Motif scaffolding. Structure first.
Motif, PDB file in Angstrom:
ATOM      1  N   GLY A 191      17.205 -28.687   7.780  1.00  0.00           N
ATOM      2  CA  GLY A 191      18.075 -27.755   7.561  1.00  0.00           C
ATOM      3  C   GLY A 191      18.457 -26.751   8.584  1.00  0.00           C
ATOM      4  O   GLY A 191      17.980 -27.025   9.621  1.00  0.00           O
ATOM      5  N   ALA A 192      19.145 -25.682   8.246  1.00  0.00           N
ATOM      6  CA  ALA A 192      19.314 -24.623   9.400  1.00  0.00           C
ATOM      7  C   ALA A 192      18.269 -23.821   9.596  1.00  0.00           C
ATOM      8  O   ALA A 192      17.470 -23.446   8.809  1.00  0.00           O
ATOM      9  CB  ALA A 192      20.520 -23.908   8.689  1.00  0.00           C
ATOM     10  N   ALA A 193      18.187 -23.459  11.020  1.00  0.00           N
ATOM     11  CA  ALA A 193      17.418 -22.547  11.359  1.00  0.00           C
ATOM     12  C   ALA A 193      18.097 -21.036  10.933  1.00  0.00           C
ATOM     13  O   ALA A 193      19.226 -21.147  10.706  1.00  0.00           O
ATOM     14  CB  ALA A 193      17.318 -22.475  12.777  1.00  0.00           C
ATOM     15  N   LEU A 194      17.196 -20.048  10.820  1.00  0.00           N
ATOM     16  CA  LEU A 194      17.562 -18.767  10.666  1.00  0.00           C
ATOM     17  C   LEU A 194      18.308 -18.144  11.704  1.00  0.00           C
ATOM     18  O   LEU A 194      19.151 -17.271  11.712  1.00  0.00           O
ATOM     19  CB  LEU A 194      16.337 -17.754  10.439  1.00  0.00           C
ATOM     20  CG  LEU A 194      15.782 -18.023   9.041  1.00  0.00           C
ATOM     21  CD1 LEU A 194      15.089 -19.216   8.701  1.00  0.00           C
ATOM     22  CD2 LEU A 194      14.437 -17.023   8.821  1.00  0.00           C
TER      23      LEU A 194
END
Ligand SMILES: *C(=O)CCCCCCCCCCCCC
Lengths: 100, 4, 275
Positions: free
Chosen positions: B1-4
């Motif tokens: 998933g995406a990093a912050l």
């Protein structure tokens, strides 16, 4: 960052009865950040074959861990938990009280 | 998933 | 309602290698899985009997997800340090909790997904499972990135599908422990502390799940400010323990009542010291 000191509880799984096998628990909760060292002690010395839970945390993001071992309560042996954390300049020792 |  | 919840923590250690990642999963208050990137063998591992039978494919699958998330958290920690203009020298913490509650139709009742940085709320998926709430202007950057990446649709698909499907499977395979409330077993102890005061300690032992309320009343008036209330604690066998204590005037003990609320009790319980 936040530095919250552990709440340290030392207690038996079952009501303590001298000469009956039991489990000695040291529960540390409400702390942050998560690096922490915990020993169970018998007569001041480290109990070695101590098991522990896996790092988890509460709704307020503070961490908790359980450390435990089989033990036999006796009249004269002293049981305790020793904890180190960034909020403590020296390790904190909490002695077992059978009604706490 | 995406990093912050 | 029943819930499945996952928890993860990444902690940086600048100058001492890459961050450490620890994750655990629960059905209700029963842990069933763990992962630690610093473990002797870093793999997903069972922590409840009702997941021990899952095949090597399940455990391979879960292990790969944990390793990927650890890698992602390393990037997130790097990004967060930039957002907040923090030094490369300090250690920082990233926490994640997400989960699904099971509804009466066997589908999602509600989902949740939240993150914290150094112990403070950062970003959360809203109840609509479509939009995000950002705690501050740094988390608004993340919000914009995740809106563009359509991240919420991904999370919603997991929460509505895979999360509820596996929560149902676990509830069936571990039904004889997961679908059983255990009421608290209570008693009140008494410890004089002076020639006119004594501690009353109200105990709750052996209960499951962990949520409980223990309160002392004097003449029916709640005494929470004067009550010492320990954190609810694991017994180690799957059940929990708690106590609440008040220091009372000796000879007034009959006027104090301990009140216990728990899902395993048909009605609230009222206790007194009897000896
Ligand atoms: C991004 O799309 C890569 C997908 C890998 C992430 C797998 C799902 C996240 C892992 C959840 C378990 C760890 C958190 C408790």
């Amino acid at each position: 960052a936040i530095q919250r000191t552990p709440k340290i509880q030392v207690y038996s799984r079952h009501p303590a009865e001298n000469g009956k096998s039991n489990f000695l628990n040291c529960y540390v909760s409400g702390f942050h950040p998560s690096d922490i060292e915990v020993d169970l002690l018998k007569n001041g010395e480290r109990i070695e074959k101590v098991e522990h839970s896996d790092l988890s945390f509460s709704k307020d993001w503070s961490f908790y861990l359980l450390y435990y071992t089989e033990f036999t309560p006796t009249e004269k042996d002293e049981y305790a938990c020793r904890v180190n954390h960034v909020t403590l300049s020296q390790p904190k020792i909490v002695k077992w009280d059978r009604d706490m | 998933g995406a990093a912050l | 309602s029943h819930s499945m919840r996952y928890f993860s923590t990444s902690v940086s250690r600048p100058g001492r290698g890459e961050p450490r990642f620890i994750a655990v999963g629960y059905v209700d208050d029963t842990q069933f899985v763990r992962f630690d990137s610093d473990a002797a063998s870093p793999r997903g591992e069972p922590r409840a009997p009702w997941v021990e039978q899952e095949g090597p494919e399940y455990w391979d699958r879960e292990t790969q997800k944990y390793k990927r998330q650890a890698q992602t958290d390393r990037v997130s920690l790097r990004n967060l340090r930039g957002y907040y203009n923090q030094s490369e020298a300090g250690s920082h913490t990233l926490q994640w909790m997400f989960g699904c509650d099971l509804g009466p139709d066997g589908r999602l009742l509600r989902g949740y997904d939240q993150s914290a940085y150094d112990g403070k709320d950062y970003i959360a998926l809203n109840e609509d499972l479509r939009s995000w709430t950002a705690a501050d202007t740094a988390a608004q950057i993340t919000q914009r990135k995740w809106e563009a990446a359509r991240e919420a649709e991904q999370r919603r698909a997991y929460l509505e599908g895979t999360c509820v499907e596996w929560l149902r499977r676990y509830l069936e395979n571990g039904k004889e422990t997961l679908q059983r409330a255990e009421h608290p077993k209570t008693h009140v102890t008494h410890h004089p502390v002076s020639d006119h005061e004594a501690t009353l300690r109200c105990w709750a032992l052996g209960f499951y799940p962990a949520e409980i309320t223990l309160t002392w009343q004097w003449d029916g008036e709640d005494q929470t400010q004067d009550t010492e209330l320990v954190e609810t604690r694991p017994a180690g066998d799957g059940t929990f323990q708690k106590w609440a204590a008040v220091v009372v005037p000796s000879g007034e003990e009959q006027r104090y009542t301990c009140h216990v609320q728990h899902e395993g009790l048909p009605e609230p319980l009222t206790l007194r010291w009897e000896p």
